[PDB]
Amino acid sequence: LEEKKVCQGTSNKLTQLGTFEDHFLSLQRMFNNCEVVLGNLEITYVQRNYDLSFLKTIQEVAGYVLIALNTVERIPLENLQIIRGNMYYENSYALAVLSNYDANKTGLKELPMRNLQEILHGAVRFSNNPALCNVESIQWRDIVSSDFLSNMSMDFQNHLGSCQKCDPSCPNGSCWGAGEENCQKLTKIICAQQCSGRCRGKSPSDCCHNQCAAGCTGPRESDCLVCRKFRNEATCKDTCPPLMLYNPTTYQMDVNPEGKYSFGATCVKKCPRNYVVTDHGSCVRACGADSYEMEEDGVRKCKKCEGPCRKVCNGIGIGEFKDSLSINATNIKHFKNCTSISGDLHILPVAFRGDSFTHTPPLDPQELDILKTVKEITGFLLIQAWPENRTDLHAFENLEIIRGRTKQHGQFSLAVVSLNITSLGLRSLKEISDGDVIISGNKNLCYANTINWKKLFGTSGQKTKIISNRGENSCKATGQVCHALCSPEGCWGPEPRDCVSCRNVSRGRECVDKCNLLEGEPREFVENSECIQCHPECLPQAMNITCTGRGPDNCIQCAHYIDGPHCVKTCPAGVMGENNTLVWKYADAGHVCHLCHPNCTYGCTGPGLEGCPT
């Protein structure tokens, strides 16, 4: 189908993930059955005699390509067509091939990237691999973009024996391997003199479209091999078709019958329901500093800010927190009073233990309470270390929505791994709009799967992974099942104030089985199954109820004077009225006060002027 299988790539630079045959497994796990790498493509520490045959299906790399200290003889990356270079290794390059020999001058000899034809951004570095040969004559100005040819480093010193040749059926002995197919096919420095782009022949009759990125198979925009900027359903456009076009005839606007939303690198019909939709038509992650998000009739938009244009806080890995790992004790003050993290929160053990490499002093676990005002996170939440004295996620008792725009390892939106906390304790979570949920490795944590997680999610295809916690059959032993009040729905904790739906009534924010309807000072009512108390000055009766409403009127009788349908401790004795009069109101036997005579303004005990001494 027209959806090439994608992967997430790696971001290890030179790190080895265990033993030589435990690194290759992690390599095989991520890159097997791949067609479009969305991240990077690291192939490092792949020792002799391993079968890297799964690479013959990769066709793009939307980052860089790093081939580190391998020893295998041949890497079958003979289908790579383009390296978009969205992220540079060493801040300069987008294809690095470094030191592919173990210790004694043997190892990687062949590397037949015969289809590689374009590198949209970044230079290329070869260095220090004295076994790779026949990549020594490739004209590197046909592949690299014409801008970066000043920043390319190349060092070919294949001084290990010799190797085969490549016949003169290819341009001036420029070959990628040894054979007929493994030799370069130029498309940029053989073109005609009237096509500013790629080509497929030494003629103006077959110059390619302006939007083809590696070389066309036809002289149109629907025949490009790899699209350069966008992709409008098998047509490599330049900008997605707008929603409203100008009208030169009438100086007005119109509506495009075919207008799509710009979702990242493709023209989609409608933005995903958890992305900010601007007016132009664009799935923005978090719109401008001025505007502020606000839910429309089923979708999210954002409008301008009037008066106070409140601050927004960037998460980790973006903004001024570009190369920060956790919320360490040098950027926690920047979260002083946030209510929405326009990003994603990483908490790692380096936050507490404190680092020495990048001069970062340790954290005070009391400072972690500043997060108690956060109300929603647009990206994801990755918790990896908590104060051990703590028994629950206390700093997040107000978290309400995890949007799930940025994700961890491209899959997870809520990760709680390897923690020492007895109960999860997010007693205000409502919706995890997108992503997955992993909660594993908590050696003593009971309440993880009692919650019906299938109703916090809001998008089809969301799974949950909850293993290796404290076994359920042990929570039953030590008497740790949640309270008898919480409905059979879930319980974020043992306390009654931590349920998800109180079975009968909820006094404030804690579950109870019966409001006080006859006894107890707070004689309340069960409106909306929430015990709500009334005016204290209402008469308490042991047989009948006290009140049926917050207003001081619904009460049967009153503990003090009554003024018509409403009663209060004392009836008017100098209150303000209408037309600038001091309204006074004298009492009666049954406490039914009556308005005083308009003469006297001091006191009132009898009807009219019978309570006006001098």
Partner: protein, 50 residues
Amino acid sequence: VVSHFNDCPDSHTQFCFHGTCRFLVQEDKPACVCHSGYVGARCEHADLLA
């Protein structure tokens, strides 16, 4: 036999979170060795897909 590896210098000590540092010398850059169950250029994160 050229080492191609030598002990991590006393300037990137404690630079590796969940692994052991080491200095591959050929290109003058350090490189962790993560334990089983940790990914990241600096052995920072945990491979949640495990």
